[PDB]
PDB file of C-alpha atoms and ligand atoms in Angstrom:
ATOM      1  CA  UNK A   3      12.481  27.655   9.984  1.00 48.40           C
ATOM      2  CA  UNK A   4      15.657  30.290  11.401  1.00 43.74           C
ATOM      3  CA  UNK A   5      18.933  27.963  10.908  1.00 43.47           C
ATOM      4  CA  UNK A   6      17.092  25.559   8.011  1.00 45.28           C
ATOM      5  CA  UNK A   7      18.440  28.420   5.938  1.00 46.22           C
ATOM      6  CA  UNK A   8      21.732  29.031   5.182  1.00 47.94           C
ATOM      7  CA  UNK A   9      23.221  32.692   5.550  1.00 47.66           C
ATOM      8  CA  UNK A  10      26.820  32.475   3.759  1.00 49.19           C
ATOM      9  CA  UNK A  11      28.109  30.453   0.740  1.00 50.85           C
ATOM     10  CA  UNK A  12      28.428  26.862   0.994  1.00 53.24           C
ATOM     11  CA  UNK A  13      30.071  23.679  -0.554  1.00 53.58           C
ATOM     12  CA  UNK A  14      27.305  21.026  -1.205  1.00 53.74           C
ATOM     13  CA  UNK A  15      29.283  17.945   0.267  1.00 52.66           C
ATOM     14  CA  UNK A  16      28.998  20.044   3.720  1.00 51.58           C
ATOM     15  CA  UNK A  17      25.407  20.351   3.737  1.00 49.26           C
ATOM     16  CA  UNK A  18      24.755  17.416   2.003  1.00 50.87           C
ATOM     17  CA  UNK A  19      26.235  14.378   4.073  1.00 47.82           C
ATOM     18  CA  UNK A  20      25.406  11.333   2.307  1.00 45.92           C
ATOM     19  CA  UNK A  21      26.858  11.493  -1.057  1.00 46.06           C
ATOM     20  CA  UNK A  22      24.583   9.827  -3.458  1.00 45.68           C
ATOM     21  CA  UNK A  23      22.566  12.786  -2.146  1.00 45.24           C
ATOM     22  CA  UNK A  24      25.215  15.700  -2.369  1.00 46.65           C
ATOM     23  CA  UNK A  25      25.403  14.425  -6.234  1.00 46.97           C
ATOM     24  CA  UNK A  26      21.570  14.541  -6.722  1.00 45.90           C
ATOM     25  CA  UNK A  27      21.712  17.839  -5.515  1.00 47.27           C
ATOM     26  CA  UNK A  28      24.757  18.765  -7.800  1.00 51.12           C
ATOM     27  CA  UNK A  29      23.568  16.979 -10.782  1.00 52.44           C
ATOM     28  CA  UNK A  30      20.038  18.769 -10.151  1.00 54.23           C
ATOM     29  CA  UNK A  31      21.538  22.383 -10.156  1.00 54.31           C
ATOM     30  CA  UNK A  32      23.492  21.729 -13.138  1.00 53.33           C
ATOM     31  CA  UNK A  33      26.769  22.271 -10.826  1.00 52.87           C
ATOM     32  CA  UNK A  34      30.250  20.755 -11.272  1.00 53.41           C
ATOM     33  CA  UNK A  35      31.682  19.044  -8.355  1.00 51.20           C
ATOM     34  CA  UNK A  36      30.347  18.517  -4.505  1.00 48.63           C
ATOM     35  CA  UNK A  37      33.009  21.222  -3.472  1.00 50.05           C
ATOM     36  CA  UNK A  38      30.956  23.917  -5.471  1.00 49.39           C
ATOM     37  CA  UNK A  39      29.277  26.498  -3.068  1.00 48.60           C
ATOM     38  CA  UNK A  40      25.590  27.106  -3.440  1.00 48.69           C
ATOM     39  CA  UNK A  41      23.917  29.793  -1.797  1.00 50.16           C
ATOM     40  CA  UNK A  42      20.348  29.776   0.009  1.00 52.00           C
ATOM     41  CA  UNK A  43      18.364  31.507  -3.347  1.00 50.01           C
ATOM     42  CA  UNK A  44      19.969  28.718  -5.120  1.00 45.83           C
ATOM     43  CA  UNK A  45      18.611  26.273  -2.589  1.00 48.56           C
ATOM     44  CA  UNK A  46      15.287  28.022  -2.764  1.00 47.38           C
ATOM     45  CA  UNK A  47      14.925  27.674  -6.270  1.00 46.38           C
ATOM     46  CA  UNK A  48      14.219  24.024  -6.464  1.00 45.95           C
ATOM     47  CA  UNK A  49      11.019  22.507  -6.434  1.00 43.13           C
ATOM     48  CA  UNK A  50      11.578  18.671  -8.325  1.00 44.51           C
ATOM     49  CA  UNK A  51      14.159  16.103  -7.060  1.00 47.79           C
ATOM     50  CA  UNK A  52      14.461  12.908  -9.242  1.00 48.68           C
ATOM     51  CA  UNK A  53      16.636  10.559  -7.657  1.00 49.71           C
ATOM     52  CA  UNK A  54      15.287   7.144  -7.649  1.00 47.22           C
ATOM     53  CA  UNK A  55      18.141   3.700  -7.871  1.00 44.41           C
ATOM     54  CA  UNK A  56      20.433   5.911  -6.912  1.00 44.80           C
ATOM     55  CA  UNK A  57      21.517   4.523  -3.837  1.00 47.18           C
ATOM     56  CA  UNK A  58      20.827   6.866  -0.961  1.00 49.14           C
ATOM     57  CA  UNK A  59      21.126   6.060   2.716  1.00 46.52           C
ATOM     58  CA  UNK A  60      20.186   9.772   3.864  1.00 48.04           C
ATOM     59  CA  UNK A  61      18.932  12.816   2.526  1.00 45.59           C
ATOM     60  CA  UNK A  62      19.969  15.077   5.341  1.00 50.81           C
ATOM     61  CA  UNK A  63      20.025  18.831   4.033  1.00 48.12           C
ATOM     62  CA  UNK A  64      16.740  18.611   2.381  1.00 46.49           C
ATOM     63  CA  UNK A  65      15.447  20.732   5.147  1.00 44.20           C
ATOM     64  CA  UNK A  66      17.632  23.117   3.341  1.00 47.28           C
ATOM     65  CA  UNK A  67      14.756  23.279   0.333  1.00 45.95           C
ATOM     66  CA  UNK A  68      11.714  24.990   1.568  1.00 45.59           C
ATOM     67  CA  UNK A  69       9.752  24.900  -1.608  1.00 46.31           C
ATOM     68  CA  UNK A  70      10.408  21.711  -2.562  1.00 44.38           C
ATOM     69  CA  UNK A  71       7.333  20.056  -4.095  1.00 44.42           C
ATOM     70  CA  UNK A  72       7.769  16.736  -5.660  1.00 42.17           C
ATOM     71  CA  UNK A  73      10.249  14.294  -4.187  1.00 42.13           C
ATOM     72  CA  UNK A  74      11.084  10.974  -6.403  1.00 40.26           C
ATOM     73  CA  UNK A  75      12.966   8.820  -3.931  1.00 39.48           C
ATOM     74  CA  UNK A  76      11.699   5.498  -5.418  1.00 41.81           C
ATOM     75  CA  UNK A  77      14.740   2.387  -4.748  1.00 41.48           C
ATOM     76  CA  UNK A  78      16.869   4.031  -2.235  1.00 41.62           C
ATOM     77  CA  UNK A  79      17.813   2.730   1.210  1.00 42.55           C
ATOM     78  CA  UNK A  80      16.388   5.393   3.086  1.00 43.40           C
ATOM     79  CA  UNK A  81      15.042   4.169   6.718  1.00 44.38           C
ATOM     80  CA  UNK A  82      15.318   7.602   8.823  1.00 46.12           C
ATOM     81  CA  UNK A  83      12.915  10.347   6.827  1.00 43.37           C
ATOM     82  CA  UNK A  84      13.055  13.403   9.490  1.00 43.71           C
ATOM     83  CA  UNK A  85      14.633  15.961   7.904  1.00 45.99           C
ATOM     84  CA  UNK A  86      11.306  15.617   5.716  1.00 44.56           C
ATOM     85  CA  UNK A  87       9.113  16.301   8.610  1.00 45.19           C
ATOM     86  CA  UNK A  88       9.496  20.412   8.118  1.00 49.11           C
ATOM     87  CA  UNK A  89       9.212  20.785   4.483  1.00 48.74           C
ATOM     88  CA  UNK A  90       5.842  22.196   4.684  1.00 44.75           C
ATOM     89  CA  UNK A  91       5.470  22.476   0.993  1.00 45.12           C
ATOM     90  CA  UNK A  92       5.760  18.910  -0.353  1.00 47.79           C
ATOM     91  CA  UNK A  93       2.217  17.209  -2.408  1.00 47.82           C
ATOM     92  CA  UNK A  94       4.181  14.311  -4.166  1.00 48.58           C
ATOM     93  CA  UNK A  95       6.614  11.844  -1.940  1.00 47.96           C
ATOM     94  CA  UNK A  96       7.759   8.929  -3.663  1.00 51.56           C
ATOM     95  CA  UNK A  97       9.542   6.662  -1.254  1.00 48.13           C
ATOM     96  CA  UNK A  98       9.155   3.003  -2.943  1.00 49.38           C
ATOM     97  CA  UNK A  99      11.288   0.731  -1.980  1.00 48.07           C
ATOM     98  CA  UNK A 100      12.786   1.821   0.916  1.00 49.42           C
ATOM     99  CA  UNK A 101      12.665   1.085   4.296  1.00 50.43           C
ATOM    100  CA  UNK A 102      10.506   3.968   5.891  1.00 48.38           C
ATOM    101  CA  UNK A 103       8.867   2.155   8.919  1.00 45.87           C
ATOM    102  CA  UNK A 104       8.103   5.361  10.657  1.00 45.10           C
ATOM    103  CA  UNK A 105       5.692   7.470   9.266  1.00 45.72           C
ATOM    104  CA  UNK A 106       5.693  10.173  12.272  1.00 42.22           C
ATOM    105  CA  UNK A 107       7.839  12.969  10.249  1.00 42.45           C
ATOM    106  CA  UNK A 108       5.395  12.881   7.785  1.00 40.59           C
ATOM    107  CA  UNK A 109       2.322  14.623  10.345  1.00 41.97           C
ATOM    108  CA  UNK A 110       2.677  17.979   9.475  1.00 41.00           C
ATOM    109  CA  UNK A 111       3.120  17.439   5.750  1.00 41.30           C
ATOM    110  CA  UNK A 112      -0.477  18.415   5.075  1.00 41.10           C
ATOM    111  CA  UNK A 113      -0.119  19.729   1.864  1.00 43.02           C
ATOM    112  CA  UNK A 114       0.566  16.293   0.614  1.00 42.88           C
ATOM    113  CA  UNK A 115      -1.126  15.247  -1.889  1.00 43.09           C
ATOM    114  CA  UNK A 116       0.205  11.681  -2.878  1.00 43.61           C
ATOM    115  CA  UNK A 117       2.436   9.364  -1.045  1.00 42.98           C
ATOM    116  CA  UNK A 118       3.922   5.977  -2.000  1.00 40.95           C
ATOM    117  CA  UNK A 119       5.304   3.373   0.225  1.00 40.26           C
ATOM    118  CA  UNK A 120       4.873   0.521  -1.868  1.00 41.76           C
ATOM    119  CA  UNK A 121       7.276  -2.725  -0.446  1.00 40.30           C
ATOM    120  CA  UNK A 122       8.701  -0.920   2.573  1.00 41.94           C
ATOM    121  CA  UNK A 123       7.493  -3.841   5.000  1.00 41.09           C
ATOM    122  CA  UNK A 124       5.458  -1.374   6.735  1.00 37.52           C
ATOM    123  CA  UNK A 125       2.858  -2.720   8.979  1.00 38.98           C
ATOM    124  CA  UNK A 126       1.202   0.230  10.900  1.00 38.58           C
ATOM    125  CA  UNK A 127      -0.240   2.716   9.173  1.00 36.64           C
ATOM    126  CA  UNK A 128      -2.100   3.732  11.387  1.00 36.54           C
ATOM    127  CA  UNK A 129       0.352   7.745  11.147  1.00 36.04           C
ATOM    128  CA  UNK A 130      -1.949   8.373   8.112  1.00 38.50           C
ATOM    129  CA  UNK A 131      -4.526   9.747  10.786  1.00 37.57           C
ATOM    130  CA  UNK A 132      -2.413  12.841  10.328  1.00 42.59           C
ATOM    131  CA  UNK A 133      -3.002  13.238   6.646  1.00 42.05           C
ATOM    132  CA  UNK A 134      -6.836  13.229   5.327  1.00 39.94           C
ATOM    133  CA  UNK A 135      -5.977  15.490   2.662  1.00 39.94           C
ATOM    134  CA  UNK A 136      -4.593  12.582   0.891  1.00 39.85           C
ATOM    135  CA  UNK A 137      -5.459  11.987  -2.917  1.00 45.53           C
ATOM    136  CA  UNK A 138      -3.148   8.798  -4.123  1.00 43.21           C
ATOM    137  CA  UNK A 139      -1.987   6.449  -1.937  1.00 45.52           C
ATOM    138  CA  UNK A 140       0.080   3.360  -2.782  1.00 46.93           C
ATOM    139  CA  UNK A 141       0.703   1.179   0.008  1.00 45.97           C
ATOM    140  CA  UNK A 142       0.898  -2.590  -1.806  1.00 44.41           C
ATOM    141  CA  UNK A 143       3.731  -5.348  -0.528  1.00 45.89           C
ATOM    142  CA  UNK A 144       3.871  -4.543   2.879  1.00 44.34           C
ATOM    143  CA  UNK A 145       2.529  -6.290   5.372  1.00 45.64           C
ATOM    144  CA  UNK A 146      -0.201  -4.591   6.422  1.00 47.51           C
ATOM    145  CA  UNK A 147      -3.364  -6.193   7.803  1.00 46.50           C
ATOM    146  CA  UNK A 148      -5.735  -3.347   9.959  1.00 45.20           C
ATOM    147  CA  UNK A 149      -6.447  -0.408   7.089  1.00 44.97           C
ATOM    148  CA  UNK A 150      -8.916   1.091  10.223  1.00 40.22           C
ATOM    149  CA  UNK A 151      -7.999   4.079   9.687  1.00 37.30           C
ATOM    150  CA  UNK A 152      -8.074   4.339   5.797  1.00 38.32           C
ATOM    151  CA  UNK A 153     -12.093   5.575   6.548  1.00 40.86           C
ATOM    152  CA  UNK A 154     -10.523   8.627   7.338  1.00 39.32           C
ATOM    153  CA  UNK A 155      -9.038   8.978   3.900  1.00 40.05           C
ATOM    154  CA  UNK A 156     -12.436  10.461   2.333  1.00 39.48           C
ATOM    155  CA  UNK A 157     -10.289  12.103  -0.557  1.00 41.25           C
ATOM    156  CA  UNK A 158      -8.340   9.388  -2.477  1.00 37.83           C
ATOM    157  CA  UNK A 159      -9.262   8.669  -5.789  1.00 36.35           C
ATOM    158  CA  UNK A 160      -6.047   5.819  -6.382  1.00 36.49           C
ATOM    159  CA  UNK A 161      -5.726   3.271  -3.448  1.00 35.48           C
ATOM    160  CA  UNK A 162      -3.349   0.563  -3.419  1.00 36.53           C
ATOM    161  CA  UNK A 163      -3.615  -2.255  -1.160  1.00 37.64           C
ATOM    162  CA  UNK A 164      -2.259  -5.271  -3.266  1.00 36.62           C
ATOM    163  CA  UNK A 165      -0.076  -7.951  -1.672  1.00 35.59           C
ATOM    164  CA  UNK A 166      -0.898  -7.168   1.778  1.00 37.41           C
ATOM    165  CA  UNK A 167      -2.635  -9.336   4.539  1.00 35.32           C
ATOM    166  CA  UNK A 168      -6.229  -7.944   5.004  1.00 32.68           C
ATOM    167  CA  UNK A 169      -9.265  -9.881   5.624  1.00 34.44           C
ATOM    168  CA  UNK A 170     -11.561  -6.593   6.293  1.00 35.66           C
ATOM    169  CA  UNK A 171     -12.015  -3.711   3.575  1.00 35.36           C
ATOM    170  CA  UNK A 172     -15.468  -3.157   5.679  1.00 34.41           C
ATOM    171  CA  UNK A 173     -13.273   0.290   6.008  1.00 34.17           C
ATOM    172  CA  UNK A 174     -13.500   1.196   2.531  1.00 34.41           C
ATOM    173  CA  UNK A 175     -17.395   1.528   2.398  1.00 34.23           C
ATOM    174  CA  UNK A 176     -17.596   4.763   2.846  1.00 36.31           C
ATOM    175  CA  UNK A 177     -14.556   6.257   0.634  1.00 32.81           C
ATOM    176  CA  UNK A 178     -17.038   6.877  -2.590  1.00 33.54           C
ATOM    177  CA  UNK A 179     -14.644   9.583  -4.339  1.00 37.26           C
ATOM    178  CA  UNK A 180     -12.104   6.180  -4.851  1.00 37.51           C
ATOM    179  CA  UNK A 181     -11.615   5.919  -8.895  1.00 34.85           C
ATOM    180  CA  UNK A 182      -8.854   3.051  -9.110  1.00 35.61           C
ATOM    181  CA  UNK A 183      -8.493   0.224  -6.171  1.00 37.61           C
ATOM    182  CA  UNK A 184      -6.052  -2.345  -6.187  1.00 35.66           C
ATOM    183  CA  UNK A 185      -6.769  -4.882  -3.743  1.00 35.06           C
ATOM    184  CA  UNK A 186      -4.940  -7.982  -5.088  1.00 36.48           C
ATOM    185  CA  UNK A 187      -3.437 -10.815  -3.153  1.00 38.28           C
ATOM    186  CA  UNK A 188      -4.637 -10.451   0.224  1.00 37.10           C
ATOM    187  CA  UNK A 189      -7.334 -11.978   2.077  1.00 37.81           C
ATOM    188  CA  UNK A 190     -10.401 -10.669   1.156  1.00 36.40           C
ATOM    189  CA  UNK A 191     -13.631 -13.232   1.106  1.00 36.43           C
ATOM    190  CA  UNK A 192     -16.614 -10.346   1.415  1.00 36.41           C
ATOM    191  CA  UNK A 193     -17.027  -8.051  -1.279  1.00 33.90           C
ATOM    192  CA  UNK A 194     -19.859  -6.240   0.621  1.00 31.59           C
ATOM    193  CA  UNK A 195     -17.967  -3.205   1.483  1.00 32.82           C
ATOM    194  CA  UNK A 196     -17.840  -2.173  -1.975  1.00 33.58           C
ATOM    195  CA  UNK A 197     -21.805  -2.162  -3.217  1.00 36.08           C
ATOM    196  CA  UNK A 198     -21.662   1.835  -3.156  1.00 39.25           C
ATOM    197  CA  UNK A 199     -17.885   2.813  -4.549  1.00 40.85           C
ATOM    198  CA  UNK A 200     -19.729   3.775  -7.840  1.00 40.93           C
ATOM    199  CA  UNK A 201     -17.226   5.813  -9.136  1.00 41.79           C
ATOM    200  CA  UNK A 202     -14.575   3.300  -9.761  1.00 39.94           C
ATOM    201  CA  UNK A 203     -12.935   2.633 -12.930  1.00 39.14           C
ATOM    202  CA  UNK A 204     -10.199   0.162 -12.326  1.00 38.09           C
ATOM    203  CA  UNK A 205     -10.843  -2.500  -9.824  1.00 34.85           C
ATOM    204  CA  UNK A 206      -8.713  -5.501  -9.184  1.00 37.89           C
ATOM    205  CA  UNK A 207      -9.218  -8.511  -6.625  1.00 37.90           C
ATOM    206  CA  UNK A 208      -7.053 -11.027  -8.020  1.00 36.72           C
ATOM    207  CA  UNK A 209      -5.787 -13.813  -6.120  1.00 40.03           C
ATOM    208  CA  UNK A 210      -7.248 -13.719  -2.726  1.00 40.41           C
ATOM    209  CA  UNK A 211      -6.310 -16.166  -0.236  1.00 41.84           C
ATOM    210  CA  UNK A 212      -8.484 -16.846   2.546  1.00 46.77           C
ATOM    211  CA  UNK A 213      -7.518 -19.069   6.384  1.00 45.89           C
ATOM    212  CA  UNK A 214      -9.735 -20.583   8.292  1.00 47.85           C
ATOM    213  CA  UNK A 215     -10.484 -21.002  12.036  1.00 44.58           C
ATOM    214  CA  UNK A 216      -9.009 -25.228  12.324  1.00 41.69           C
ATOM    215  CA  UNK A 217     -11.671 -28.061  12.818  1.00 42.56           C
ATOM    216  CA  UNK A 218     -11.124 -31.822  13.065  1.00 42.30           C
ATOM    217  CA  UNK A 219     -10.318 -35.078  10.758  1.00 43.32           C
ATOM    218  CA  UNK A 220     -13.869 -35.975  10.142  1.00 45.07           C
ATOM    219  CA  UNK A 221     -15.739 -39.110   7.566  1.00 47.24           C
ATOM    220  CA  UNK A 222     -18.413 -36.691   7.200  1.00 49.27           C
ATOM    221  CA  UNK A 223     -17.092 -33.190   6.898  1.00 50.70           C
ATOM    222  CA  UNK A 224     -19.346 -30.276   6.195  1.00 49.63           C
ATOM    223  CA  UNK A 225     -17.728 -26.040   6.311  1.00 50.33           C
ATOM    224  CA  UNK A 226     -20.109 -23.521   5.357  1.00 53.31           C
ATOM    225  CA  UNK A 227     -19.010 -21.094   2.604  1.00 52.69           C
ATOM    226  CA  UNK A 228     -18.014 -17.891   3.661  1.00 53.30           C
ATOM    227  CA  UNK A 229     -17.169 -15.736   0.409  1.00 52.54           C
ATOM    228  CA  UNK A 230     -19.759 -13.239  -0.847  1.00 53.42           C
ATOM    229  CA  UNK A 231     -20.233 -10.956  -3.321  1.00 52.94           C
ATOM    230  CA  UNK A 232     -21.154  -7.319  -3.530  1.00 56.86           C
ATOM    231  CA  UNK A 233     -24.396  -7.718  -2.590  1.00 56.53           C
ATOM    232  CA  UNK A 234     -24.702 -10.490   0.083  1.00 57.42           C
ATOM    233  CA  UNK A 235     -25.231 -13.379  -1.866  1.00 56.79           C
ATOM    234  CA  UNK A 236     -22.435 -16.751  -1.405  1.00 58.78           C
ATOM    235  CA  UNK A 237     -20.619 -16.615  -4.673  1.00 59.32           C
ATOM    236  CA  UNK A 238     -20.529 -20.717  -5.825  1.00 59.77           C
ATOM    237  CA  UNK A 239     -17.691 -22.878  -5.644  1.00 55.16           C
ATOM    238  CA  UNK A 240     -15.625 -22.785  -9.050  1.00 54.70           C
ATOM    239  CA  UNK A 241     -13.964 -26.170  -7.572  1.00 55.27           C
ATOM    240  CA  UNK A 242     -13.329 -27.844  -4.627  1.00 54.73           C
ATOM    241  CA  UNK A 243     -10.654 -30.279  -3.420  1.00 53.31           C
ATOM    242  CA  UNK A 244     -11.283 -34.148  -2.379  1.00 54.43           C
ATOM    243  CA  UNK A 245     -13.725 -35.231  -4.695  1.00 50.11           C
ATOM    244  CA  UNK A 246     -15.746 -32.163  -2.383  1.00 51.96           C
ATOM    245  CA  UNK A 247     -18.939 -31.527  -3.409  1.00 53.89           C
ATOM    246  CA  UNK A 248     -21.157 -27.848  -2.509  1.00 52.27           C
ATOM    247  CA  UNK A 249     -25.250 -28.546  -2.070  1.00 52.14           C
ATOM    248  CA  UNK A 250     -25.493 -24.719  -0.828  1.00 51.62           C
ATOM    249  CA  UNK A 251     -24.313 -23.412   1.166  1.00 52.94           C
ATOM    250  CA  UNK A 252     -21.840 -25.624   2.316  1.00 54.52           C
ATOM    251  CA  UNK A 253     -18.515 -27.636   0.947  1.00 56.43           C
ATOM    252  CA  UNK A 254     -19.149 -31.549   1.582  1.00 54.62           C
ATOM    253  CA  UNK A 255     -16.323 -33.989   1.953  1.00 51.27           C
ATOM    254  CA  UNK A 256     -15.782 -37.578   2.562  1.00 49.94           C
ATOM    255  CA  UNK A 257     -12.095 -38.960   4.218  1.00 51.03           C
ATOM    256  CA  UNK A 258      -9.752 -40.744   6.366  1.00 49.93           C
ATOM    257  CA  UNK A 259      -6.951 -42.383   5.060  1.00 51.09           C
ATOM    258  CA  UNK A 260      -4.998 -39.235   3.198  1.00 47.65           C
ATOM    259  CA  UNK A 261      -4.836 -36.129   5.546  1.00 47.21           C
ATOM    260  CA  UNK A 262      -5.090 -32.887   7.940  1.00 46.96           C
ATOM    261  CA  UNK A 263      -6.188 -29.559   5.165  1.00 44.29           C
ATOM    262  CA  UNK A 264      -9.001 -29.063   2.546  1.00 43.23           C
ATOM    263  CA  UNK A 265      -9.887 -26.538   0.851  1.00 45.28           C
ATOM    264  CA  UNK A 266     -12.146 -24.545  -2.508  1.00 42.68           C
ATOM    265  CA  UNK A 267     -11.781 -21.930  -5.135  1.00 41.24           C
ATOM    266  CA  UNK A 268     -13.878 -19.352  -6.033  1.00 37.33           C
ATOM    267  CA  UNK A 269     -14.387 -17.263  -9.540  1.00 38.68           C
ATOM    268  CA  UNK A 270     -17.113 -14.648  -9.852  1.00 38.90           C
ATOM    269  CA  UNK A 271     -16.600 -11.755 -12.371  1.00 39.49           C
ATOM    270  CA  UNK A 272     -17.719  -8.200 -10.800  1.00 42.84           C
ATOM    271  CA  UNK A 273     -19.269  -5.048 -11.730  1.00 42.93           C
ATOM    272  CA  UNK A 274     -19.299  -1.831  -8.979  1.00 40.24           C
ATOM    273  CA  UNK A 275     -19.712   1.335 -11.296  1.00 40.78           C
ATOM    274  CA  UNK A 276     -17.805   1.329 -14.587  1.00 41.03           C
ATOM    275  CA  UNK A 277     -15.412  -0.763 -13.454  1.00 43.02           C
ATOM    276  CA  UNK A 278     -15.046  -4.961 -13.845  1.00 44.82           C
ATOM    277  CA  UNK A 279     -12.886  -7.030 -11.928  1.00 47.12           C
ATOM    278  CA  UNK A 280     -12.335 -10.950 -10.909  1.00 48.17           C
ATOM    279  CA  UNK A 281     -12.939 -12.050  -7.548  1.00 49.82           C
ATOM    280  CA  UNK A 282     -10.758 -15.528  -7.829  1.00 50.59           C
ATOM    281  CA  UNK A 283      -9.693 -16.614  -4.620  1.00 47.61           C
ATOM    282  CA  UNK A 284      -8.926 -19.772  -2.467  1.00 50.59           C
ATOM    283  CA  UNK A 285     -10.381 -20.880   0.859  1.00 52.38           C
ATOM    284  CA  UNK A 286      -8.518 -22.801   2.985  1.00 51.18           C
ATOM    285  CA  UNK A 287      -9.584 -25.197   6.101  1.00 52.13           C
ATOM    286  CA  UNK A 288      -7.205 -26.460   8.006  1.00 51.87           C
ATOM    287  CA  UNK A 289      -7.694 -29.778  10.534  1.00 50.21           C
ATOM    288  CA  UNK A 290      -5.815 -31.586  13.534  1.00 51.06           C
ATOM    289  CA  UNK A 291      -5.773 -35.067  14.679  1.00 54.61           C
TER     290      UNK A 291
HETATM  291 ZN1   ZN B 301       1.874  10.768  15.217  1.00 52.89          ZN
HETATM  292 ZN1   ZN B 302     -13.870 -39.140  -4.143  1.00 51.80          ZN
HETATM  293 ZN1   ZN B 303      -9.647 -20.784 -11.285  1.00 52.61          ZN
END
């Protein structure tokens, strides 16, 4: 908008605060020093930033770049992200390893195409309501747990969800354009969601890890198994703690004298569309005295 343009000559370090930023915009101009002056068409001109490691705490300014298109940001130590929240123009945001907790300056970015928060502790992401026009979306090593509103994102075709916390991808069923899903390390024991993503090519559902609702130190203990595949059906045990034993479609055990949590794995190798994948995964069952 009016005064996110400047009207006379200007030194970089001025507009630029933070000054891992003030040299990304130097070095990216081919400039000499921060005390240069750079005028708006200058500004104007630039449509790429790469700046990732390169330690930035703020990249206030950037409202200065109206066309700006692709922003690598990747291992910085942004938190704050407004001056974003204007830059109309933007498709590619790469903001890795940060600290972005905040996603409401991204709402009226809605010519974004592909955003990346990967390990930024986020939990709520439930902002992306504001931006269905997504197409890549890397979210994995936060801590998120409700993906609700993911349903939404009917135009992703690369979905990352690995190292997370969710027991329910029931909100994946209906995104059929996905090609690649990562879904790794969370806690995913039903596979039904995803009988009709046929247009996957890379799948992965490594290493889930699935808790259980307590019971009690019993001689006779008998938990029902919980983990299905694709298509409904309980995958079987591919071993199971305490000389445990699985007659479908339960885990068996026999106790007293050791202790308080049991527990089985589970293997089953998947096909959905052209893709393979492992389900391998651990249920847990935890008891009190
Ligand atoms: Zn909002
Ligand atoms: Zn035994
Ligand atoms: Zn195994």
């Amino acid at each position: 908008l009016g005064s996110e343009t400047i009207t006379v000559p200007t030194p970089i370090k001025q507009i630029f605060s933070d000054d891992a930023f003030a040299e990304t915009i130097k070095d990216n101009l081919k400039k000499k020093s921060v005390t240069d002056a750079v005028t708006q068409n200058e500004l104007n001109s630039i449509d790429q930033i790469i700046a990732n490691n390169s330690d930035i705490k703020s990249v206030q300014g950037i409202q200065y770049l109206p066309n700006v298109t692709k922003l690598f940001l990747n291992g910085n130590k942004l938190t704050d992200i407004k001056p974003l929240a204007n830059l109309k123009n933007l498709g590619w945001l790469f903001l890795d390893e940060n600290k972005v907790k905040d996603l409401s300056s991204l709402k009226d970015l809605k010519k974004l195409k592909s955003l990346s928060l990967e390990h930024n502790g986020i939990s709520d992401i439930n902002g992306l309501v504001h931006l269905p026009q997504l197409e890549s979306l890397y979210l994995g090593n936060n801590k998120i747990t409700d993906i609700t509103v993911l349903s939404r994102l009917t135009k992703l075709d690369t979905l990352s969800l690995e190292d997370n916390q969710i027991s329910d991808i029931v909100p994946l069923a209906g995104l059929t354009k996905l090609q690649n899903l990562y879904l790794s390390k969370n806690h995913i024991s039903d596979l039904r969601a995803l009988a009709g993503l046929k247009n996957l090519d890379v799948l992965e559902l490594f290493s889930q890890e699935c808790l259980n609702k307590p019971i009690n130190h019993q001689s006779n203990l008998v938990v029902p198994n919980t983990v299905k595949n694709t298509d409904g059906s309980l995958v079987t045990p591919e071993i199971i703690s305490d000389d445990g034993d699985y007659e479908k479609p339960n885990v068996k055990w026999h106790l007293p004298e050791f202790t308080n949590e049991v527990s089985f794995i589970f293997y089953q190798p998947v096909t959905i569309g052209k893709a393979k994948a492992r389900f391998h995964g651990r249920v847990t069952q935890p008891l009190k005295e």
